[PDB]
Structure formats: C-alpha cells, structure tokens
C-alpha cells in the first residue's frame, strides 16, 4: 500500500525542504514514528545532500 507511509513522509518533507524523499520513507519503515524519524534526521542518522 505505502499510503500511510507516503502521507507521513510528505509531512516531514514539508518540515525539512532539504532531505531526500527516499531516505525519509526509509526511516519511516524502520521507526514508523514521525517523533523519531524527524529526530533521527536532526541527529545525523540520515545522509545530507553532500556532493561526491
């Protein structure tokens, strides 16, 4: 389905207009909680847009 996952991810996408959408959906399947997902991003669990 991924209906609820997309809905939750999009919400975070609005909060952080500089985070990879596919990475957001990734943690959403692990934590399944916006209270921890958005936190994990701020902590540094998610990779930022770094050139390579």
């Amino acid at each position: 389905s991924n209906s609820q996952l997309n809905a939750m991810a999009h919400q975070i996408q609005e909060m952080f207009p500089q985070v990879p959408y596919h990475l957001v959906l990734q943690d959403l399947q692990l934590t399944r909680s916006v209270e921890i997902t958005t936190d994990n991003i701020l902590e540094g669990r998610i990779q930022v847009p770094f050139p390579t």
Binding site: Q11, M15, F16, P17, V19, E35, I36, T38, D39, L42
Partner: protein, 76 residues
C-alpha cells in the same frame, strides 16, 4: 503579528507574537495551548533549527510564517 505552527499530525496552531519575542517564549506559549514540554520541542524554520536563546528577528521570522515542530526522543 500572528504566526502558524504546523505539527507533524497536520495540526495548525496560531500564535500571536512579536518580532522581539524569543524562541524560548514561543515554545512556552505552545506549552500553554498544547502542553508539550519545550525540551522536546524542536522548532525548525525552512529546514534550519531555531536556537532556544534567540529571537524571531535572528532568523528573519516574519508574520504568517510556518514554524515546523520537530519532536525528539533519545532512549538509546
């Protein structure tokens, strides 16, 4: 001026503040309406985190601006 705080649940809270207000006070006002502890309240603006010891003028936060409320739970 009035601003709009958007919660992860899709809730929109309207707060009447001034540019001379502090981020700490803003979060305290949210605790007055919602009850959420300011310690667990991470205010983000356009992807940037707002330091507790700052004002709205520091991040150029104007009226009707969207404030992102991020949560945090470190248990390991």
């Amino acid at each position: 001026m009035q601003i709009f705080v958007k919660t992860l649940t899709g809730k929109t809270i309207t707060l009447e503040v001034e540019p001379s207000d502090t981020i700490e006070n803003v979060k305290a006002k949210i605790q007055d309406k919602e009850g959420i502890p300011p310690d667990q309240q991470r205010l983000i603006f356009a992807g940037k985190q707002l330091e507790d010891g700052r004002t709205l003028s520091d991040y150029n936060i104007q009226k009707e601006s969207t404030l992102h409320l991020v949560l945090r739970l470190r248990g390991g």
